Ligand binder design. Structure first.
Ligand SMILES: Nc1nc2c(ncn2[C@@H]2O[C@H](COP(=O)(O)OP(=O)(O)OP(O)(O)=S)[C@@H](O)[C@H]2O)c(=O)[nH]1
Ligand SMILES: C=C[C@@]1(C)CC(=O)[C@]2(O)[C@@]3(C)[C@@H](O)CCC(C)(C)[C@@H]3[C@H](O)[C@H](OC(C)=O)[C@@]2(C)O1
Ligand SMILES: Nc1ncnc2c1ncn2[C@H]1C[C@H](OP(=O)(O)O)[C@@H](CO)O1
Ligand SMILES: [Cl-]
Ligand SMILES: [Mg+2]
Ligand SMILES: [Mg+2]
Lengths: 329, 189, 190
């Protein structure tokens, strides 16, 4: 019994992180990933700094001393092989504590900033050590763009799984076709929390809207008419945080949210705020409207609320996935 | 089913030979369309017979481009030799048709060995064909070959077990594909 | 037995970007997955032949990812078959756009068309494969190999006939074609 699972979704949705969780759960190299982690750190600090003067209105530094640290970061921005001197971490840490730099970060949906920004900037004192060893969670946050197709093989209770990972960015989508034939099921991943952001490819198209269009293309594809789709509504942790913070309203991006009330079959988590329940179920339904419109009996869609970086949530959901695949597929 | 049924199968350890008329557009631009086809039919009929003798399966004729493979349908460990012997027969044949017809016909011959995918494509007008990087390379060897001689790759030389005397081909200096991919070529004597 | 013809319209339609898309890896089964997609494309093209408006079009063969066809082989009002060939080229473009929409690609067609006398029949001792030969066919192939993406390049004489039928043409200029020398060509308007 061998199941071939194909991961699909737009860029930065969470596909590569899902694969990592399979490796941790069902299957040394940590030293090699340190360089990638320091790059993420450098990219996060330089991006937030470069955006300060371009926003409308511009954000000002809370401390004049920090103007020199900004000048420092920008001068090393394009440097190819950065040796990461001890000074670099001192400046980054100093900048990240400046209230002005923090305010610019609260407006990050207005420019392009990686998701692991706050996670790495909060532990500069840990990463800077020469004796530093990346934790499991560090490797799960480390972002590295996917180019091409990658096959990961694992076994669970003597049942085989071949999982294919593909680049989600526009130019990468032209490779997916090579995995369509004889696929057991598709796992479509979505960044539920990216409703107030635009994609990188053009800097204008709404992220969630791009996912919706991409899903509609997959669901109605001529070569996937009988292929079921397991839908991962990812980034549940960032969704709740955004919803609760109340600064970026969902209905100001998707007007239809104002006519939406929580469904009966709704199963909120214990202690979950009604507002969070209302938002996550809304995003699920926009996806269900598409799957409901066609196919009828030939294939189905199975939604799941997920948080890729949370290994515990992934074990639980992948188990539910094993149930779906065996009941019919 | 989702996709149409594909009628293709993979085959390792085969040899591909390509032959092409030098300056064909120039040639057919001079004589009548009737005369040209007589010269080509006289030539390709002989090639098709020589193919049966040499254990080669002909693929197709692209106007002036003739090509076949050895090691199909049934696998043969004697493949590379068949194609070399086949190319040899072609060179003499072209010579006779050059003599009895008077037309200036000269062909370049290129050979390479590796894997291929063979079968058919589409729904209408099925014509057995082959596709693969190795088939693509074999094609370039012809483009990078020399008039009236057999041009082979290092991969084909390794299947020939040292039965033919060759000389440095220098195919890298006559075709950009062979250079870019770092291919060592040879010319059979 | 062979046969001579006086006015056959030959078309060569390529997909220049395909060669690049093709790759051999362990994931795509040594290029088998790419060939599967080519099979879908050639098939979608092949079924346009069943459309009544395309009864006079004869598929000759596929050369790699290039599609070869001809009209006027049913002969032997005077020149409508040349215009039908151009209409067939537009149809292929629509088939390829449909393919792009489903395979997330951006393939574009490059067409070359010409007309004149040819010779039809079989050749060689192996199999009964119908084909056409002649300078007309050679030139058509050059109208493709020296063409432009999303354009239909035609010869001067083919351009005149297309105009009497109601088609507009733009002059590409004088290009030196391998084996023919300087030729004045044209692009069909849309
Ligand atoms: N907080 C949080 N971060 C997440 C979650 N899922 C993924 N991320 C982070 O988002 C980033 C992008 O995820 P990643 O898996 O790299 O995307 P991808 O879908 O593979 O992207 P691509 O290769 O198509 S360009 C990573 O840094 C990852 O750790 C999640 O549920 N919560
Ligand atoms: C399917 C793609 C690929 C790469 C496969 C292949 O080997 C070819 O089909 C050959 C080499 C191969 O099929 C032999 C015939 C011929 C006519 C020489 C082909 C063309 O050159 C194709 O490219 C063109 C230009 O159509 C090419 C190279 O395309
Ligand atoms: N019947 C045909 N089938 C395929 N290709 C053809 C045909 N007639 C002519 N050609 C090709 C051969 C030439 O390419 P080469 O073989 O020389 O590369 C080109 C111009 O004569 O057109
Ligand atoms: Cl997304
Ligand atoms: Mg990825
Ligand atoms: Mg030639």
């Amino acid at each position: 019994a061998t199941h071939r699972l194909l991961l699909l979704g737009a860029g930065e949705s969470g596909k590569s992180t899902i694969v990592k969780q399979m490796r941790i759960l069902h299957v040394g190299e940590k030293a090699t990933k340190v360089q990638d982690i320091k790059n993420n750190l450098k990219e996060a600090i330089e991006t937030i700094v470069a955006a300060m003067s371009n926003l409308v209105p511009p954000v000002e530094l809370a401390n004049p001393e920090n103007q020199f640290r900004v000048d420092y970061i920008l001068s090393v921005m394009n440097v190819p092989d950065f040796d990461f001197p001890p000074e670099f971490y001192e400046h980054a840490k100093a900048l990240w504590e400046d209230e002005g730099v923090r305010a610019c970060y609260e407006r990050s949906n207005e420019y392009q900033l990686i998701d692991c920004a706050q996670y790495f900037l909060d532990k500069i004192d840990v990463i800077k050590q020469d004796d530093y060893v990346p934790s499991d969670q560090d490797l799960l946050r480390c972002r590295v763009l996917t180019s091409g197709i990658f096959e990961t093989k694992f076994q669970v209770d003597k049942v085989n799984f071949h999982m294919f990972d593909v680049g989600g960015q526009r130019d990468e989508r032209r490779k997916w076709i090579q995995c369509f034939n004889d696929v057991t099921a598709i796992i479509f991943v979505v960044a539920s929390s990216s409703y107030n952001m635009v994609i990188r490819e053009d800097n204008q198209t709404n992220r969630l809207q791009e996912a919706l269009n991409l899903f509609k293309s997959i669901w109605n594809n001529r070569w996937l008419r009988t292929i079921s789709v397991i839908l991962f509504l990812n980034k549940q942790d960032l969704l709740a945080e955004k919803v609760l913070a109340g600064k970026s309203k969902i209905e100001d991006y998707f007007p239809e949210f104002a006519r939406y009330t929580t469904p009966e079959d709704a199963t909120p988590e214990p202690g979950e705020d009604p507002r969070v329940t209302r938002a996550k179920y809304f995003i699920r339904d926009e996806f269900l409207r598409i799957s409901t419109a066609s196919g009828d009996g030939r294939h189905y869609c199975y939604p799941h609320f997920t948080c890729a970086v949370d290994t515990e949530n992934i074990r639980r959901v992948f188990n539910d996935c094993r149930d779906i695949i065996q009941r019919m597929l | 089913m989702m996709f149409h049924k594909i009628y293709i199968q993979k085959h390792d350890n085969v040899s591909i030979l390509f032959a092409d008329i030098e300056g064909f557009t120039s040639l057919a631009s001079q004589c009548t369309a009737q005369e040209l086809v007589m010269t080509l039919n006289e030539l390709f009929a002989r090639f098709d017979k020589l193919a049966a003798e040499n254990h080669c399966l002909r693929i197709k004729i692209l106007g002036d481009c003739y090509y076949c493979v050895s090691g199909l349908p049934e696998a043969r460990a004697d493949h590379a030799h068949c194609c070399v012997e086949m190319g040899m027969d072609m060179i003499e044949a072209i010579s006779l048709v050059r003599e009895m017809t008077g037309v200036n016909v000269n062909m370049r011959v290129g050979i390479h060995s590796g894997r291929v995918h063979c079968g058919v494509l589409g729904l209408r007008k099925w014509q057995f064909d082959v596709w693969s990087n190795d088939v693509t390379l074999a094609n370039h060897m012809e483009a990078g070959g020399k008039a009236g001689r057999i041009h082979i790759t290092k991969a084909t030389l390794s299947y020939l077990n040292g039965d033919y005397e060759v000389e440095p081909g220098c195919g890298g200096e006559r075709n950009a594909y062979l250079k870019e991919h770092s291919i060592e070529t040879f010319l059979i004597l | 037995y062979h046969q001579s013809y006086d006015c056959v319209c030959v078309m060569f339609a390529s997909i220049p970007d395909f060669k690049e898309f093709y790759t051999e890896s362990d994931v795509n089964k040594e290029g088998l997955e790419c060939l599967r997609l080519l099979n879908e494309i050639i098939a979608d093209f092949d079924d346009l032949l069943s459309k009544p408006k395309f009864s006079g079009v004869e598929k000759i063969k596929t050369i790699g990812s290039t599609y070869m066809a001809a009209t006027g082989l049913s002969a032997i009002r005077q020149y409508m078959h040349i215009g039908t060939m151009v209409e067939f080229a537009y149809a292929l473009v629509g088939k390829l756009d449909a393919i792009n929409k489903h395979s997330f690609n951006d393939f574009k067609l490059r067409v070359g068309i010409n007309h004149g006398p040819v010779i039809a029949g079989v050749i060689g001792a192996q199999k009964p494969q119908y084909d056409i030969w002649g300078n007309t066919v050679n030139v058509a192939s050059r109208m493709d190999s020296t063409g432009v993406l999303d354009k239909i390049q035609v010869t001067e004489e083919t351009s005149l006939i297309l105009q009497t039928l109601g088609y507009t043409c733009t002059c590409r200029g004088i290009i030196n074609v391998k084996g023919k020398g300087d030729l004045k060509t044209y692009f069909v308007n849309t």
